[PDB]
Design a protein around this ligand. Structure first.
Ligand SMILES: *[C@@H]1O[C@H](CO[C@@H]2O[C@@H](C)[C@@H](O)[C@@H](O)[C@@H]2O)[C@@H](O[C@@H]2O[C@H](CO)[C@@H](O)[C@H](O)[C@H]2NC(C)=O)[C@H](O)[C@H]1NC(C)=O
Ligand SMILES: *[C@@H]1O[C@H](CO)[C@@H](O[C@@H]2O[C@H](CO)[C@@H](O)[C@H](O)[C@H]2NC(C)=O)[C@H](O)[C@H]1NC(C)=O
Ligand SMILES: *[C@@H]1O[C@H](CO)[C@@H](O[C@@H]2O[C@H](CO)[C@@H](O)[C@H](O)[C@H]2NC(C)=O)[C@H](O)[C@H]1NC(C)=O
Ligand code: NAG
Ligand code: NAG
Ligand code: NAG
Ligand code: NAG
Lengths: 423, 272, 347, 42, 49
């Protein structure tokens, strides 16, 4: 029936066709998760947030965190993510999580968009897009431990004065995810608007006069914060996982050789696990190929498991339109796999076949060749027959002086037809 | 062009070029062709009507050979299907969305407004331009294949239709006698008529005959076999008919140790 | 060529339900790929079957176990009792097959072996067929049947050298057949009688030299390696293009489904679908070119058998360099390997 | 730095490879770099 | 927006400039693949001619 659908017709010519292998099923789970520490957010939750140009950075590596508590405390006004989504952050593991948090008014959120020509991008913060990142603007809890700053301040100018004496001016712009050297003028925030700060740069710093101007905006009724969040994958042996209820750790010992889903220290997927001689460096928990695929694993059991991809048995259908019967060729798989692990069969050189009957026939011409000198001959079941090799006639040499020949006595005219394409 | 190849005249057969033109009737050309494959004129003169009856049976049989089981007739359909599949690919690629919201430009204009509709239209443009480039590359390869197959078509007509090839396998199996070509869809259709032996007789042969004289004069057959039927006889390669050894079928050769030393009932070439 | 077919649903989507839902729009294009590859493999089966119909020997003669008269043909002869698996494989054919690295597809137990194989092996490209989705198909004839057709050519009897056509079968022994072929090039029977054993020594030393002529510097053996590599590089392109991101965040549908949500994840999968469907079209397009090229070359193989193996050629350059005396043929990976024997004067 | 003895080569952070030759982007020293020599009195 | 990377780098900022450049990378690699396949057939045709 799948052959009819593939050809989209009830009338299909007799032949041997390749159909889709049936869907493979997972047969268990292989979970190995440690009881890792809780990610320390006590700096973000207990303290006064800094300014945009003096942002704090948190990197979490080998810990679990409760994202529900963090999201309950804050009230997100707008988030813009590229490369990843917040739900994916909420339901998956990653090698690292970097959170750059700072105080930021919601009115200026337009000045943090990619491509802005304003002063925030040049002198205060520029988001890096080398990793899957999201930018989040929210509101802090009203009466919790987060204390509002005096005001919101940002750097409006950061230039270098190097000319005949000072006339030539050159602005100093920050690379993505980096601080401005004008931050050290007022590292705890600018006191008033238009504060003018001047420092003499040393020779090792290039020389000149560094000029910085700060801009201050009044504090709002509720504290408004901005977060720049980035994650990494495949760069660590341990993962940062939100406290999702994955379940208890399981042992692959009882399910070796079957295809199961796995969650191994934050790395997820499906595949087959086989006992293997230890290769690679044990300290690095995973062994990869050139194409960045997981091919080996080291377990708490102490063994090294080869992670073969989850596969399915190839299928082929033999169809004979006139007799209206079919057989199934399971290629390259012995009948023991089909007979005992299916979720009568006959073993042939092309695989295991259900439908044919071994009558031990030999046929000179058969139009359904299975391969390896095997073909199906219709009979009401198709029968497995072998293509015949007609033995050449043998003419023994003559023992006398001369030689023996076979000359024709009767003949016919045989018309051989040939077609040559020309256009 | 093709129907004129049937009555064409190119030479006497034993001639060695295309310069001459001999108006030998079609009947007498076949018998000379059959005499070139190893049948003596005595068999032809005796089985004159037998050959024609066999030939007419072969010509009537090719009427029923136009079936999918035949290899040559299948190649005709494969060429028509190759042409048809070329047009099918062009039609199918306009049902391709290439990732757009639709495969129809009308749907994109109906469903979307600029600047988003330009991006969706440009998605179809790049896909269809890429599809045509793949179509052009395939057509060029097919055109060269047909061009080089047309060269073989000119080769086949010159060697099989306008002459009698001595090459085994080429111009059909068996032994080539005459080939007829007719117009076919997107090419030509040939009919390689061959001499197919049906029954055999095992007969003792001799590599050659020599006489016990000084120096020993020895002969070898021209295009047949020395054959026993104590006397030796000449037979054709393609048909059995013992005939006397004479200058018409005996060719002088140098002395060899594998030839028969004859002392009685010598052939006329070895006499005197 | 190696017969390859793909599962378009599996190759594009890798068993993911979300991807297959999107692939329903491109359902027509998946079906055509399966039909173009299937149609291009029936041509291979018809080509192989028609080839061995032309190579077929109607009548043959017995040959001695090795020394035929004074000529030695042990390298070209199938043994009476064979320790090896292949019943109709010649010793020189063993050396050719022992000098070429071919990965065993495992036509009947390959799927089980790939599951058993923990450490990577040379069949990694073969075992990738159950992962990516393509399927290497078995050839029409097994090696034993192929060897039977070529072995029957050594003892093939046709009409005599002077005879017209192929309507008669003369039982001339191998030695006397070689001497006739040398007599047709300008060597008198007086010379052949006097230098009879010298010719046999010359012929035997030529046959023994090709036992060590299978080197990468040789042109003929270089071609047999390129044929195997061309088959291997066709499977490598199938597997490697499954790691092409096509502008998406990842080349694996799992990672897209783990980092993105609709409508963005469906767009990313659409990039892989379009890229993989176009890659399959290129793979199909070049497979047709290769199959037709091998089909036309399969025609040339039968032409050389009927002009070099079954008969002495009066051509120049055809059937090898020099003046043609005899030519033998053995089965080689994806084709034939002829040994054209010529007459090369030295003084 | 010879780099044929794998001098100054940082391993991949969280992956391992077995019996393969790979190309990697990373912070690596230059071949033949003499560097800067420092001597301590000990 | 343009066939030249120079115009893409002058007119856009990340992450948009990477997506536009990725359009050219995929297109030119696919074009290079078509050039290889076309050249292979021409090479084989001239090798048998
Ligand atoms: C699973 O892991 C290893 C198997 O390693 C084997 O190493 C070779 C000997 C070869 O047989 C490979 O195919 C395998 O990958 C086993 O660990 C050792 O097992 C032996 C015998 O049981 C024991 O003497 C050692 O002390 C074990 N060493 C360690 C470090 O555990 C292990 O027993 C296997 N478990 C099975 C098969 O159930
Ligand atoms: C005919 O050729 C074969 C093949 O070269 C010769 O057999 C070889 O004999 C010696 C020792 O047995 C070695 O060169 C090889 O081991 C043999 N090769 C085989 C068995 O394939 C054989 O000796 C030759 N015959 C004569 C009479 O010299
Ligand atoms: C870089 O390393 C290679 C290999 O480690 C060095 O080559 C070795 O040189 C010594 C001589 O001091 C020989 O004894 C070894 O046999 C060589 N090993 C080889 C060739 O594999 C090479 O000299 C080093 N380059 C330097 C030191 O500049
Ligand atoms: C996470 O926090 C919520 C609310 O504070 C709580 O209900 C839940 O039990 C916490 N989960 C863990 C694992 O502590
Ligand atoms: C069919 O049965 C016969 C009976 O002995 C057996 O020899 C043969 O191997 C069987 N065929 C196959 C394909 O197993
Ligand atoms: C014929 O005679 C010659 C010379 O006596 C001899 O060498 C040869 O073997 C003889 N052949 C036959 C067939 O008698
Ligand atoms: C390592 O790879 C080579 C191929 O370069 C292979 O021959 C060898 O068997 C492999 N060794 C192991 C232990 O896998």
């Amino acid at each position: 029936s799948q052959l009819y659908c593939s050809y989209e017709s009830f009338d299909v010519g007799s032949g041997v066709y390749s159909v889709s292998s049936f869907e493979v099923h997972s047969r268990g789970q292989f979970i190995e998760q440690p009881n890792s520490v809780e990610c320390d957010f006590t700096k973000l939750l207990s303290g006064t947030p800094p300014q945009v140009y003096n942002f704090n950075r948190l990197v979490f590596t080998n810990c679990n965190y409760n994202l529900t508590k963090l999201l309950s405390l804050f009230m997100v006004n707008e988030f813009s993510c590229d490369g990843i989504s917040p739900d994916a952050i909420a339901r998956g593991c990653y090698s690292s999580l970097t959170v750059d948090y700072f105080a930021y008014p919601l009115s200026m959120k337009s000045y943090m968009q990619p491509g802005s020509a304003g002063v925030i991008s040049q002198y205060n913060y520029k988001q890096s897009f080398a990793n899957p990142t999201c930018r989040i603007f929210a509101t802090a809890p009203a009466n919790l431990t987060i204390t509002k700053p005096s005001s919101y301040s940002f750097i409006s100018k950061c230039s270098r004065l190097t000319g005949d004496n000072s006339h030539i001016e050159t602005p100093i712009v920050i690379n993505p995810g980096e601080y401005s050297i004008c931050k050290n003028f007022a590292p705890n925030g600018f006191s008033q608007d238009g504060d003018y700060f001047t420092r003499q740069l040393s020779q090792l710093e290039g020389g000149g006069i560094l000029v910085g101007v700060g801009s201050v905006t009044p504090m709002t009724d509720t504290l408004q914060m901005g977060f720049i969040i980035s994650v990494q994958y495949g760069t660590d042996t341990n993962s940062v996982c939100p406290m999702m209820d994955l379940g208890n750790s399981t042992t692959i010992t009882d399910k070796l050789g079957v295809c199961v889903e796995y969650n191994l220290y934050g790395v997820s997927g499906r595949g087959v696990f086989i006992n293997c001689t230890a290769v690679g460096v044990k300290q690095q928990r995973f062994v990869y190929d050139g194409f960045d695929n997981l091919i080996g694993y080291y377990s708490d059991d102490g063994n090294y498991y080869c992670v073969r991809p989850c596969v399915s048995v190839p299928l082929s259908v033999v169809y004979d339109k006139t007799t209206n019967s079919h057989a199934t060729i399971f290629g390259s798989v012995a009948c023991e796999h089909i007979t005992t692990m299916l979720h009568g069969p006959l073993q042939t050189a092309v695989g295991c076949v259900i439908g044919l009957v071994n009558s031990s026939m030999v046929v000179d011409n058969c139009q359904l060749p299975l391969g390896q000198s095997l073909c199906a001959v219709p009979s009401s079941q198709l029968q497995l027959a072998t293509i015949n090799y007609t033995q050449p006639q043998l003419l023994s040499p003559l023992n006398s002086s001369g030689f023996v020949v076979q000359v024709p006595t009767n003949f016919s005219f045989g018309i051989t037809q040939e077609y040559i394409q020309t256009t | 062009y093709t129907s004129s190849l049937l009555g064409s005249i190119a030479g006497a057969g034993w001639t060695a070029g295309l310069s001459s033109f001999a108006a030998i009737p079609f009947a007498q050309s076949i018998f000379y062709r059959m005499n070139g494959i190893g049948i003596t004129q005595q068999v032809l003169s005796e089985n004159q009507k037998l050959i024609a009856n066999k030939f007419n049976q072969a010509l009537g049989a090719m009427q029923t050979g136009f079936t999918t089981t035949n290899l040559a007739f299948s190649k005709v359909q494969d060429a028509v299907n190759a042409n048809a599949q070329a047009l099918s690919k062009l039609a199918s690629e306009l049902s391709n969305t290439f990732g757009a919201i639709s495969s129809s430009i009308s749907d994109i204009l109906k469903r979307l407004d600029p600047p988003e509709q330009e991006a969706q239209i440009d998605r179809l443009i790049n896909g269809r331009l890429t599809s045509l480039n793949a179509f052009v590359a395939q057509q060029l390869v097919r055109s060269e294949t047909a061009a080089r197959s047309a060269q073989l078509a000119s080769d086949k007509v010159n060697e099989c239709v306008k002459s009698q090839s001595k090459r085994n396998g080429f111009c059909g199996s068996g032994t080539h006698i005459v080939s007829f070509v007719i117009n076919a869809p997107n090419g030509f259709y040939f009919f390689h008529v061959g001499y197919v032996p049906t029954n055999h007789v095992n007969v003792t042969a001799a590599y050659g005959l020599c006489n016990t004289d000084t120096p020993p004069r020895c002969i070898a057959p021209i295009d047949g076999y020395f054959v026993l039927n104590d006397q030796w006889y000449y037979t054709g390669s393609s048909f059995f008919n013992p005939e006397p050894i004479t200058m018409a079928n005996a060719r002088y050769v140098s002395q060899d140790v594998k030839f028969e030393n004859l002392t009685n009932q010598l052939p006329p070439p070895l006499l005197n | 060529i190696q017969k390859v077919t793909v599962d378009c649903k599996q190759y594009v989507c890798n068993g993911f339900q979300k991807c297959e839902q999107l692939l329903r729009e491109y359902g027509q294009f998946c079906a055509k790929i399966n039909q173009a590859l299937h149609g291009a493999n029936l041509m291979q089966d018809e080509s192989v079957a028609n080839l061995f119909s032309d190579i077929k020997t109607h009548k043959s003669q017995p040959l001695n176990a090795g020394l035929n008269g004074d000529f030695n043909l042990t390298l070209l002869q199938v043994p009476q009792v064979s320790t090896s698996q292949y019943s109709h494989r010649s010793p020189i054919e063993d050396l050719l097959f022992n000098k070429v690295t071919i990965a065993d597809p495992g036509y009947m137990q390959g799927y089980d072996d790939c599951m058993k194989q923990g450490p990577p092996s040379a069949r990694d490209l073969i075992c990738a067929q159950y992962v990516a989705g393509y399927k290497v198909l078995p050839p029409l004839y097994d090696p034993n049947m192929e060897g039977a057709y070529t072995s029957s050519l050594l003892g093939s009897i046709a009409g005599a050298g002077w005879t017209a056509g192929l309507s008669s079968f003369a039982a001339i022994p191998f030695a006397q057949s070689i001497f006739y072929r040398m007599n047709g090039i300008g060597i008198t029977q007086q010379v052949l009688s006097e230098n009879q054993k010298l010719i046999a020594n010359k012929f035997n030393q030529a046959l023994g030299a090709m036992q060590t002529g299978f080197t990468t510097t040789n042109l003929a053996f270089s071609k047999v390696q390129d044929a195997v590599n061309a088959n291997a590089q066709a499977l490598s392109k199938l597997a490697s293009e499954l790691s092409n991101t096509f502008g998406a965040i990842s080349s694996s549908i799992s990672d897209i489904l783990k980092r993105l949500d609709p409508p963005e994840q469906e767009a990313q999968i659409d990039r892989l679908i379009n890229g993989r469907l176009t890659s399959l079209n290129a793979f199909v397009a070049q497979q047709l070119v290769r199959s037709e090229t091998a089909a036309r070359s399969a025609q040339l193989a039968s032409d050389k058998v009927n002009e070099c193996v079954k008969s002495q050629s009066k051509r120049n350059g055809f059937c090898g360099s020099g003046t043609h005396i005899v030519s033998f043929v053995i089965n080689a990976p994806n084709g034939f390997y002829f040994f054209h024997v010529g007459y090369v004067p030295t003084n | 730095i010879n780099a044929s003895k794998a001098d100054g080569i940082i391993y991949p952070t969280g992956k391992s490879y077995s019996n393969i030759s790979l190309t990697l982007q990373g912070l690596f020293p230059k071949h033949g770099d003499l560097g800067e020599q420092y001597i301590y009195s000990v």
